[PDB]
Design a protein around this ligand. Structure first.
Ligand SMILES: O=P(O)(O)OC[C@H]1O[C@](O)(CO)[C@@H](O)[C@@H]1O
Ligand SMILES: [Mg+2]
Ligand SMILES: [Mg+2]
Ligand SMILES: [Tl+]
Length: 329
């Protein structure tokens, strides 16, 4: 233990080649601090009376919980103080946040400060999702800098407040998992260069929406339960927190689905701070992420609170579902 491979060392070491201003390390160091603070609050939320609602609703019409506010505040303050950012997009804010000139750095950060709100009060896994872009424009920073396609991401990932707290970080050459050591408050590298299985045996979707599903999703699910070739049926898992279901998809393989449906043309999940970050992790792990008709990372957003269908995970599973959409087109 006298040689600790922390997230900071990792993001410093591997990136010494391309030099750079080093504000990405500043950025990620800052975000780790917010994530530790959120993790600590979550782990004692009931004793600190942090369960319940804040008394408000956000642009996508969610009921804001107390932990939403706390986590939102923590993430915004640390990112600003990092001197690495210029434009911030949060699920909890109607408009992009523009950093004050004095603290401006070159990155644009889209994040969900707390994901899995329906699972807060029952103590199921929740998390934090983020995607990071380089501001391209030369003009004054604005909400427009956030409206980039996911393929432009330079870094993305999530923190998972599960049985242990994990920071999953994807960058151009790959995905790596860091676990929070609660004793020293450091994120330690525990899974290097993570890759997803080509084919899994778990499917993950809320089948409560069966009555609204399109024929392709309907057929796909029926095929998981009754395989035509006599293989064993897939097992089902749906934690109900995107970070938990996506992380399982990553480390066990399989598919996660939040598709469009008869009442929700664009699905539910948010493109900027939910879908794109997870699509990027998946793609860097050798996985795929599709709306059913097009790659999530290639969508050019027009609304920072825009929704998108998303189907992701093991390439052979996701490809199987795409063939069914193509067959139905
Ligand atoms: O209750 P539903 O419609 O299955 O929504 C679950 C999804 O909603 C979210 O909480 C986003 O609001 C995700 O974390 C999760 O994947
Ligand atoms: Mg969420
Ligand atoms: Mg949220
Ligand atoms: Tl959502």
């Amino acid at each position: 233990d006298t040689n600790i491979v922390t997230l900071t060392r990792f993001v410093m070491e591997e990136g010494r080649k391309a030099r750079g201003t080093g504000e990405m390390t500043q950025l990620l160091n800052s975000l780790c601090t917010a994530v530790k603070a959120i993790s600590t609050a979550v782990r004692k939320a009931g004793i600190a009376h942090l369960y319940g609602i804040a008394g408000s609703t956000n642009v996508t019409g969610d009921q804001v919980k107390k932990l939403d506010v706390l986590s939102n505040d923590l993430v915004i303050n640390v990112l600003k103080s990092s001197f690495a950012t210029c434009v911030l997009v949060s699920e909890e804010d109607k408009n992009a946040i523009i950093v004050e000139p004095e603290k401006r750095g070159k990155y644009v950060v889209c994040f969900d400060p707390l994901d899995g709100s329906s699972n807060i009060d029952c103590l199921v896994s929740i998390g934090t999702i983020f995607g990071i872009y380089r501001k391209n424009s030369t003009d004054e920073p604005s909400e427009k800098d956030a409206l980039q396609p996911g393929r432009n991401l330079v870094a993305a990932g999530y923190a998972l407040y599960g049985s242990a707290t994990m920071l999953v970080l994807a960058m151009v050459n790959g995905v790596n998992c860091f676990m929070l050591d609660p004793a020293i408050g450091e994120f330690i590298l525990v899974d290097r260069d993570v890759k997803i299985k080509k084919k899994g045996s778990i499917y993950s979707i809320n089948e409560g929406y069966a009555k609204e599903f399109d024929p392709a999703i309907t057929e796909y699910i029926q095929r998981k339960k009754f395989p035509p070739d006599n293989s064993a049926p897939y097992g089902a898992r749906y934690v109900g927190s995107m970070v938990a279901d996506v992380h399982r998809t990553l480390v066990y393989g399989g598919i996660f689905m939040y598709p469009a449906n008869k009442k929700s043309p664009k699905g539910k999940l948010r493109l900027l701070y939910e879908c794109n970050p997870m699509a990027y992790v998946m793609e860097k792990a050798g996985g795929l992420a599709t709306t059913g008709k097009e790659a999530v990372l290639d969508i050019v957003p027009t609304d920072i609170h825009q929704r998108a269908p998303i189907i992701l995970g093991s390439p052979e599973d996701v490809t199987e579902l795409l063939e069914i959409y193509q067959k139905h087109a």
